[PDB]
């Protein structure tokens, strides 16, 4: 089923250490990222953010009474050529809404759709990802 060109980004980090959680994608093993996912029909960006966090990293924000911060930032970028196949014919642009999720500490992550995870300092995490929007969110909402 086609991914939708409306997505969310959840930058997860540790409040105490400020390290950022980076996940290794299965479709592009050189692509490390925060939590990302499409916004489904009839679902809001915050709803999709909490769903992806629960589906990808097994973190129930409602159960743990965590706070998903709406960054009130939306960006549009070109879908990577080698990844555009998952989108409807003709779709090349993707709009991404940013969210932040500050965990009290670093923790073991049980991922489902990624190959591995790694806690890195904000500058390192930003320099590691291939997504410029993911870099910008870490810099603007974790480093500063």
Numbering used by the authors: 5 to 148
Which lines from the publication concern this structure?
Optimized crystals grown in ~35% PEG 8000, 0.05 mM ammonium sulfate were soaked in a range of dihydroneopterin concentrations and either 10 mM MgSO4, NiCl2, or 5 mM CoCl2. We solved the respective three ~2 Å resolution structures in space group C2 containing one monomer per asymmetric unit. Although crystals soaked with Mg2+ contained only water molecules in the active site (not shown), those soaked with Co2+ or Ni2 appeared to be metallated. Second, based on the fact that the Mg-soaked crystals contained only water, we infer that metal loading in DHNTPase is substrate-assisted, like other Mg-dependent enzymes involving nucleotide substrates. The main difference between our structures and those previously reported is that there is no shift in loops labeled L2 and L5, which was proposed to be a conformational change needed for catalysis. Notably, in the absence of metal, sulfate binding to apo DHNTPase is detectable, and associated with +1°C thermal stabilization. ITC data could only be fit by a sequential binding model with stoichiometry of n = 2, taking advantage of the a priori knowledge that two sulfates were observed crystallographically in the apo structure, one in the active site and the other on the surface ~ 20 Å away. We suggest that the higher Ka site corresponds to the active site sulfate, and may be a distorted binding site utilizing positively charged Arg29 and/or Lys7 in this region, and the second site is the one stabilized by Trp136 and Arg97 remote from the active site. In silico docking of the substrate DHNTP to apo DHNTPase followed by minor manual adjustment in the metal binding region reveals a binding pose compatible with the metallated structures, its bound sulfate anion, and the previous PPi-bound structures.
DHNTPase catalyzes the hydrolysis of 7,8-dihydroneopterin triphosphate, the product of GTP cyclohydrolase, to 7,8-dihydroneopterin monophosphate and pyrophosphate. DHNTPase belongs to the Nudix hydrolase superfamily (InterPro IPR000086; Pfam PF00293), which catalyze the hydrolysis of a variety of phosphorylated nucleotide molecules and their derivatives, as well as some non-nucleotide substrates like DHNTP. The motif RExxEE binds a required metal ion cofactor, presumed physiologically to be Mg2+. To better understand how DHNTPase catalyzes its reaction and drive drug discovery efforts, we solved crystal structures of apo, Co2+-, and Ni2+- bound DHNTPase in a new crystal form.
